[PDB]
Amino acid sequence: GAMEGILDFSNDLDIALLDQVVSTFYQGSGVQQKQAQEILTKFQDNPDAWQKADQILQFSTNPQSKFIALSILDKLITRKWKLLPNDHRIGIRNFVVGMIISMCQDDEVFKTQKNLINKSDLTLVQILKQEWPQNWPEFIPELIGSSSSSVNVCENNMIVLKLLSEEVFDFSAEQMTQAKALHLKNSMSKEFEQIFKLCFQVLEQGSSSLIVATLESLLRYLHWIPYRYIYETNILELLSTKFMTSPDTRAITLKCLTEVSNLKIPQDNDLIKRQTVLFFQNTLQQIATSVMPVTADLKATYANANGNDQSFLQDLAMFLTTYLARNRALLESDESLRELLLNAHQYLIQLSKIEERELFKTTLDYWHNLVADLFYEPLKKHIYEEICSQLRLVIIENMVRPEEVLVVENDEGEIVREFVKESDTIQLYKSEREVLVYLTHLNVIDTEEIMISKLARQIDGSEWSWHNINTLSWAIGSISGTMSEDTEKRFVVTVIKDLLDLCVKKRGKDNKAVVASDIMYVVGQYPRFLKAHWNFLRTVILKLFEFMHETHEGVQDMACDTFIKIVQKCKYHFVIQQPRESEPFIQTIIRDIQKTTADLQPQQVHTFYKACGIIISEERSVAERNRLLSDLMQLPNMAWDTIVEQSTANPLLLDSETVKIIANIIKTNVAVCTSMGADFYPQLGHIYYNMLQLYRAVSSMISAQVAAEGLIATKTPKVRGLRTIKKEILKLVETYISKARNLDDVVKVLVEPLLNAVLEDYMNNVPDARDAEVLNCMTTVVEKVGHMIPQGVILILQSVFECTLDMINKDFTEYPEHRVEFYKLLKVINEKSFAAFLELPPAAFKLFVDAICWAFKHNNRDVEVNGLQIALDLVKNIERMGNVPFANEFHKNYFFIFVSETFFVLTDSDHKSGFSKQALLLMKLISLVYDNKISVPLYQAEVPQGTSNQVYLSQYLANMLSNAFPHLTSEQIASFLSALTKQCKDLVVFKGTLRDFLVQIKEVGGDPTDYLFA
Amino acid sequence: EEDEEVLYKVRAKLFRFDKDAKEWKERGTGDCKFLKNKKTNKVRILMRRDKTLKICANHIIAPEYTLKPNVGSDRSWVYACTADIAEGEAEAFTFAIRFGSKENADKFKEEFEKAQEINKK
Amino acid sequence: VQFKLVLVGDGGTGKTTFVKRHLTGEFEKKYVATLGVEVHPLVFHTNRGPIKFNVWDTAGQEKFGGLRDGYYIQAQCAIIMFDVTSRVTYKNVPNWHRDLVRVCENIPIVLCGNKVDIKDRKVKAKSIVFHRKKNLQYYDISAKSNYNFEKPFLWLARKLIGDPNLEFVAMPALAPPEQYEHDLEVAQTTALPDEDDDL
């Protein structure tokens, strides 16, 4: 349409049309906005568009047009500046400087076009990065001089200086070579005495917008300037008094003072210590007199969210915590400073009552810092006894729901099972617990008194609420371990007496759910107590078993989790025969397992079985242990036996009910194997032969289904159910082998039938019917017994290598699980059974190299990392062979493939996560040649005979980089390679040099001497 | 919806079929309710997304609709809707709705068909 | 009435997927890189009336960045996205924030760590602190599971409207009105995604 005209550079730029295109983009909507956007992007990206910048700045009536002109220049300056003729450089500097001057001198423009002026300032800073000070030595003196001629210019100069400081000190590490960053930091340092002089004078002579700008610049300077500028001038007095009083300057001053608190400062100097105290004292006095007293309800103020109150309270928290964590010792010894110390901490107590999760994390971090110090440092805790007492209350009343507590209140006021895990409060709980534990140690009497009296006011009804019983119960559970066994005993007895009263008194499914969840949490948290009180432990377990029949699904599920949580810690007491019992409790449990688990979902049944395995593995006498295992597996083994008959006579297609039964039997075996590990063997051996036969039968069913119905069959509930059987069988075998202690039996009894059953079936199924779990099972097999089964490993590779590679080598996304397991398998084979790869035919070994490099190119961390590790391990494997024909041929065929492929992912800007491991690999490869560890010539008389591999390597690399990055000079390439090769024994320096190259390839005219940095 | 009786409620995930791409796309997860209008006796499906409470289904349970299985699921139904107004102006869709269990899916079908008889009255 | 929202962050962090979820309810599994920016209106109903966000969903890949900071001009709020399974994306957060606040000097901004549904988390909860000194709100989120998905919009709405007790509300639902064979058969025989999901 009309808009596309600005794209025709053969005609003059119609600035009016440009302004229309820009307005359509920013102010328009729909297709017109979308079209306008594409046009502007094309315009912006035109490599001559920068030539139009002057005209747009001069003639445009649209500030966004001028912003875009400046972005166009920014791109030119940052990437192509040194490609320009010298007069274009001078011209661009002149019109940017001139535009800025012009916009500042017009008060109306200065007031109303802040975005455009900020953009101009940033663009000027990009020119400084290129030209200053070497080709602009008077920039700073002239800036300083110009500051006196105008309040507008002066203010804007502070913006420019802020941006320069940021670009040099805060954001240079990724954007500049080490050498260039040093040059610019040194240059700013050398002229800072006069920058500061101007800053301090403006601050002394108090225009508010100018003051704020000056203070914004100071905030940046504080990141790097020497402390004497802050301590040897009167600036601390100004910041902590004058600038705290006006709200416009208070916000930035407070952030400056926070950074002041982080300055590097002499530790042995009383005068400086006095100054550090004084600014804090001044600041706190200003808060109390001009903002709010220490009694103020900051919770309420924050919740009101007037003006900038929330950010101010956040910044106050940051200031107080930062200062006190560093300096509170300055205030602890001198009686005259005690009031300040405690008032500061009282503000923190008030801040900690604010409802704002992230802010709470910040203050809690501080409390952790404090209490951890009080726990150790002699004679300190008494100072803070009243602060700590208030803190106990705060933490107890704001305990987040533990991960174990599975019930929550819905929007209708019903107590229901959570839909999902509250994953984002996991860390919060740990932090709260950590602080509360320290606080308990610091005063166990106070903590107990607080909890026992709060609990008493739940029971008598005075303070009863779900919220209140919950936070309290969670708190009580969280402090397990802090009391002496003896004190804990009385405490737990008192707490449980009260909670049991509450359970009798508070009826209805909602109340019962809340109280049950809280008691289960508490009892599960005190195994030491349970272990010492068998009668009580037995009663808890029987109650949990009752809850396994609850119609409340949240309570029921929590009962199963609590059962296993208790068993994990107390299992010994279930395996012995307790005084006054006729049998070990494990016998009682197993005898009644059908009744106890009748109302549970299958996965909860499996958890129950898993808990039983934990107990049984406590029995170290093999005869007795195997007997217990046999008893435990009675129900699934009896169901199994009857299914093995119904398969033995048939094989035909299992109905869905039978498929589910089979899956659940195997899942039960998995669950028990998980807790028993090596002890599980007799049970595995009991089902093993028939289980692998069943694997084959189900495999034929799946194949037959795909043949009759198509690939779509794999989506059906029937086929998915059949594959679940296969996956769980694989999981069972993997689980056992991962924990096996008798590796001889693994090899002699388990491995041959497994491979026979799984490998050909994987190989000969269509891609969509292949289970990635086969690969996962084989990884554990190779990991645990690979050294003992060299022919087995070969068979695994033959069966899965080429066909799996073909599934995953068309794109980066299809078959994501196969992809990830594939590379884990190759990794362990390369690590444990390298001989397997030596045996491959050359064509297959080439696919292996290809597969590794393909891994490199993934952005998927689960693939990329393994690819790089395999490459590194492979190189080590080859090197370990010494001067033999396989190694010589390996290097001849593949050394340069690995070098170039590694260089490619290092330099393409799409694989930044792998930088460290790529650098490692490159360094290994370069060091192989540098150390003459490659015996044969890497070249063919393509170069003079007798030419060292070192010499050829440089030549190859220089040529490679010359062609891949033609914008680099030959000297840039030569200098880079000289540095890189010299540095191949020093990874930290080597990586620095790589990082410098990555900067230089993004621009023109990078300085080759940068690679001499040291 | 105070002029309406809640005949049936169930947690569900609703999908709509994009014909042009050959794929099902989620439209919302939340409570699917069957609401009977107290003045007109007509029964609609009304479903809202969790948290945002935005309407992801709003249509009469037409007597002519038929619940069909999806090849991949034993806990889902697919059907054609000629007039859904969740997003504004009435529009035709092929919907699929999946539940936590087969039992839930089978209850939904039963209730769906009851509602259809009511709409015939 | 309406507010310009800019959405920024590394390529692949889930910006577009997050917006789409809010727009249509769908979860887009494929990664199609955004080219420059895509603008979408997005309306929420609140106890304080409707609030419309004009969402400028920007490209995170440098090679597709288009106008870059030019997109930020006159934004009234922002979301900065990273991926908790990718540490480089959190490392780049200060860079995005820098570019954003240079243009938008005083706007409410939410920081979101996406993809918390993935088991192998790499950016540890404890590590996420950049927001504190910058006064950004922070939320763990998942566009895939919908974990906290509404939180950034609710917070921004509260800041923009100036009411901290603002809530999303259900709006009354109007009474609805009173080759088919082939199209249905195709839908019946295309499997539903994620059949292993709870719902």
Ligand SMILES: *[C@H](CC(=O)O)C[C@@H](O)/C=C/C(C)=C\[C@H](C)C/C(C)=C/C=C/[C@@H](O)[C@H]1C[C@@H](O)[C@H](C)[C@H](/C=C/C)O1
């Ligand atoms: C609701 C009321 C009820 O009694 O059922 C309780 C219900 O919400 C959940 C209870 C749970 C999960 C565990 C209980 C703690 C199990 C029980 C009832 C234990 C009872 C133990 C008593 O023998 C107990 C009474 C107290 O004097 C203390 C705790 C002594 C302990 C002596 C060492 O024994």
Ligand SMILES: Nc1nc2c(ncn2[C@@H]2O[C@H](COP(=O)(O)OP(=O)(O)NP(=O)(O)O)[C@@H](O)[C@H]2O)c(=O)[nH]1
């Ligand atoms: N597991 C998981 N994947 C997600 C989530 N959100 C998005 N993704 C996936 O991440 C990939 C990238 O998503 P996309 O929204 O395109 O990312 P983007 O930040 O917009 N990229 P760009 O800046 O290049 O336009 C997609 O495959 C998408 O399905 C999530 O919460 N969990």
Ligand SMILES: [Cl-]
């Ligand atoms: Cl502008």
Ligand SMILES: [Cl-]
């Ligand atoms: Cl024990």
Ligand SMILES: [Cl-]
């Ligand atoms: Cl040169």
Ligand SMILES: [Mg+2]
């Ligand atoms: Mg995108």
